[PDB]
Amino acid sequence: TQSMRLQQKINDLKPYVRHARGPIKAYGQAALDRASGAVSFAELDATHLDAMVYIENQRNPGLNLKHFRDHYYLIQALQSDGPSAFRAIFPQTCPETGQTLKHHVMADVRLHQGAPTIIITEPAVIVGARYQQLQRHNLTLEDLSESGVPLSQVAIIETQAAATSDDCVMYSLNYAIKAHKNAAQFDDIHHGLQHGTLSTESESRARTTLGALEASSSYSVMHEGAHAAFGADVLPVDFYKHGASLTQAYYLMKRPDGRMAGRVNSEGHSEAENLVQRNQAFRVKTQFSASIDGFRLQEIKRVLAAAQR
């Protein structure tokens, strides 16, 4: 697929798709076609998300991942007897219509004895080219607040890893898994949020699209109390592995704190791989990393593997 790493993921998935039947087979073929260089995946990913969530919860007990069809049901889950730690994927909602509009995000949640803390990871941008994502995030914050969640215990972390919103379900799913794998670091962020604080926010918020808008307008444009920061400042390099942009990867590795500049593949591998090397390994053709499309192939394979053994 012009990319040997991607082609290997294509070849690994193909026989499962051949033996599969029904909607999941079609989903697999579409994903294969996409990785090969061949309609709207936000809707397709979302349709099959429950199956992948169900599988991943089994592969990694404690992941506690849920797909909610609206953030309304996230709020309901905060008012129930479930686990103290869980993750949620949900689409954004248009305030004027109640219509859900994809543009998914991942929320990592902690319940506390006896005022939850909530980290929302935004794989694209908080504000949006037509300020639509900002309005959708404000709706979530507004509803959280009205339900009794202090927004000072809520953070929206903007990573800008996604170049478009077409793959946001896959970024959100990947992000849920990474949040679980890095639960200790998330635990620490939640502890801060219990005290109404987010580390690095005093500098990091200004680096986000939200921060730019706040500085430009001198207006409060996000509901007061909620925190925001740029992904690289507060999250591990894990969250940038599927970043589309080669140049982003380059600049992230240039950061003085070196936090984005280490190994990104597991140690079991003979040769180490950093963020730029990974991006180039998944480069396809105007050039971008199709790594996230590889992640989708991996997830479908995991689902079909359960169905076929």
Ligand SMILES: O=P(O)(O)O[C@H]1[C@@H](OP(=O)(O)O)[C@@H](OP(=O)(O)O)[C@@H](OP(=O)(O)O)[C@@H](OP(=O)(O)O)[C@H]1OP(=O)(O)O
């Ligand atoms: O063992 P897991 O924690 O479930 O890791 C898997 C995978 O390994 P397996 O297919 O053997 O299970 C790769 O991880 P590596 O050991 O090769 O580093 C893979 O990486 P590639 O994308 O390069 O193929 C991918 O990881 P990722 O999302 O980090 O890119 C993924 O980890 P996830 O399940 O969290 O996606």
